[PDB]
């Protein structure tokens, strides 16, 4: 699968759509290990610790849930140690060193990975 390494700072709110709105695309949705690998390359030349990725903790009060913005199935993951429960908000980061996944707020501003 495709994917773009933008470097500007946005919220995840903003970062989604400029997917749609300049590339017209979804936020990056991993399905294997590889194309997890070669993201990681793609960021390990930022200084940014994270990068958005298409995570959002759905569900309601005690039904945290998972899911991908673009609508394709939860069938694989790479969270790191210590997660992804007790600490952080709704929408999931990418941390450059290691390529570990980790909880965020979504308001956060953080570079990200469109895919087209």
Same mark, same amino acid.
């Given at each position: @699968? ?9 919220? +995840?709110?903003?970062?989604? +759509?400029?997917?749609?709105? @300049?590339?017209? *695309? %979804?936020?990056?949705?991993? $399905?294997?290990?590889?194309? %997890?690998?070669?993201? !990681? ?6 200084? !940014? *610790? ?8 759905? *569900? ?6 998972? !899911? ?8 694989? =993951?790479?969270?790191?140690?210590? !997660? ?5 908000? $709704?929408?999931? =980061?990418? @941390?450059?060193?290691? *390529?570990?996944?980790?909880?965020? $707020? @979504?308001?956060?501003?953080?570079? +990200?990975?469109?895919?087209?």
């Amino acid at each position: @699968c495709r994917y773009l390494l933008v470097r500007s700072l946005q919220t +995840f709110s903003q970062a989604w +759509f400029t997917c749609r709105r @300049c590339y017209r *695309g %979804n936020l990056v949705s991993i $399905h294997n290990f590889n194309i %997890n690998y070669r993201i !990681q390359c793609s960021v390990s030349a930022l200084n !940014q *610790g994270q990068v958005w990725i298409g995570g959002r903790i759905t *569900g309601s009060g005690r039904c945290r849930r998972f !899911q991908w913005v673009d609508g394709s199935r939860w069938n694989f =993951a790479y969270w790191a140690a210590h !997660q992804p429960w007790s600490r952080g908000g $709704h929408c999931v =980061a990418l @941390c450059t060193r290691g *390529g570990h996944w980790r909880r965020a $707020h @979504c308001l956060r501003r953080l570079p +990200f990975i469109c895919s087209y």
